[PDB]
Structures are given as structure tokens and as C-alpha cells.
PDB file of C-alpha atoms in Angstrom:
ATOM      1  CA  UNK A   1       0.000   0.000   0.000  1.00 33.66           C
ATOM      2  CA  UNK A   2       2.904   2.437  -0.833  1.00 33.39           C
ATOM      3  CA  UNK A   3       5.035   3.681  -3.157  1.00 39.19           C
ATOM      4  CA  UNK A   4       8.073   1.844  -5.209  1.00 37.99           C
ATOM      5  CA  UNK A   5      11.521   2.480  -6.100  1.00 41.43           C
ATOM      6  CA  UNK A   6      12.127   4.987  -8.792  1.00 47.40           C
ATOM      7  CA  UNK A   7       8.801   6.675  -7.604  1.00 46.56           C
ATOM      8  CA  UNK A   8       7.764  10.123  -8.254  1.00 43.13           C
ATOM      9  CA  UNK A   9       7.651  11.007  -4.242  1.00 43.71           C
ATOM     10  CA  UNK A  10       6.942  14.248  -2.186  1.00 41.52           C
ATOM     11  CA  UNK A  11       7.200  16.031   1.021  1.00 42.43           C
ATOM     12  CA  UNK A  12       3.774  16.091   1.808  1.00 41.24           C
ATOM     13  CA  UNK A  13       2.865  12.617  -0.073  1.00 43.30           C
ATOM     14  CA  UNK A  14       5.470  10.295   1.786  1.00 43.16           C
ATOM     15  CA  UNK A  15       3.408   7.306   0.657  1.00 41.47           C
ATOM     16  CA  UNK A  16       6.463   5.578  -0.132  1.00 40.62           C
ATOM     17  CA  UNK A  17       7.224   2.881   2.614  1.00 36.00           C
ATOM     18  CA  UNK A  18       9.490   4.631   5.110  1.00 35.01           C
ATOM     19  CA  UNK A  19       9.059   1.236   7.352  1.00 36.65           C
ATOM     20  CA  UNK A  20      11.331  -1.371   4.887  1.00 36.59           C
ATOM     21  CA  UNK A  21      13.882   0.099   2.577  1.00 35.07           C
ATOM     22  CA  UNK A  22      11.592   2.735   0.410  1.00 34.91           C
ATOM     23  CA  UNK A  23      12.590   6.908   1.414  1.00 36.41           C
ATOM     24  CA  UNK A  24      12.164   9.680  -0.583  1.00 34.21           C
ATOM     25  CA  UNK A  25      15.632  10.536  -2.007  1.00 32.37           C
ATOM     26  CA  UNK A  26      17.393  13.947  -0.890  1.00 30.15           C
ATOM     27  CA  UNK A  27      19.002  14.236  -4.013  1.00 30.99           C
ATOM     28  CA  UNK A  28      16.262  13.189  -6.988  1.00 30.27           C
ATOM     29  CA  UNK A  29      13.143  13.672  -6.503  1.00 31.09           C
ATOM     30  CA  UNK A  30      12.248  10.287  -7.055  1.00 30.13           C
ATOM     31  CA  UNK A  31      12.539   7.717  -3.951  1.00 27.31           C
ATOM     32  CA  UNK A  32      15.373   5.730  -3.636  1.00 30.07           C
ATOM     33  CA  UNK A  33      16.369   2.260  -1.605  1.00 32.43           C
ATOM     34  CA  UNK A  34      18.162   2.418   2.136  1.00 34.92           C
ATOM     35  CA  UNK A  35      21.409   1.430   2.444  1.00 35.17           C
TER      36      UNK A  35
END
């Protein structure tokens, strides 16, 4: 029920799933893995 890798993802849409490995990248604006 979230977002994937690669992911168009925003500040106030953090859908992307902050819980496994999925957080909005810094960098890109698209969300990256978690090293």
C-alpha cells in the first residue's frame, strides 16, 4: 500500500514505505532504496 523504487515522491505525499527500505531521495526527486 505504498510507493516503489524509482517513484515520483513528495514532502507532503510520503506514501512511499518509510518502514522497509523505500525513502524519498534527498538528491532526486524520485525515492530511492536504504542502504
Amino acid at each position: 500500500e505504498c510507493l516503489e523504487i524509482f517513484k515520483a515522491c513528495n514532502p507532503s505525499n510520503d506514501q512511499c514505505c518509510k518502514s522497509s527500505k523505500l525513502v524519498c531521495s534527498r538528491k532526486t526527486r524520485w525515492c530511492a532504496y536504504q542502504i
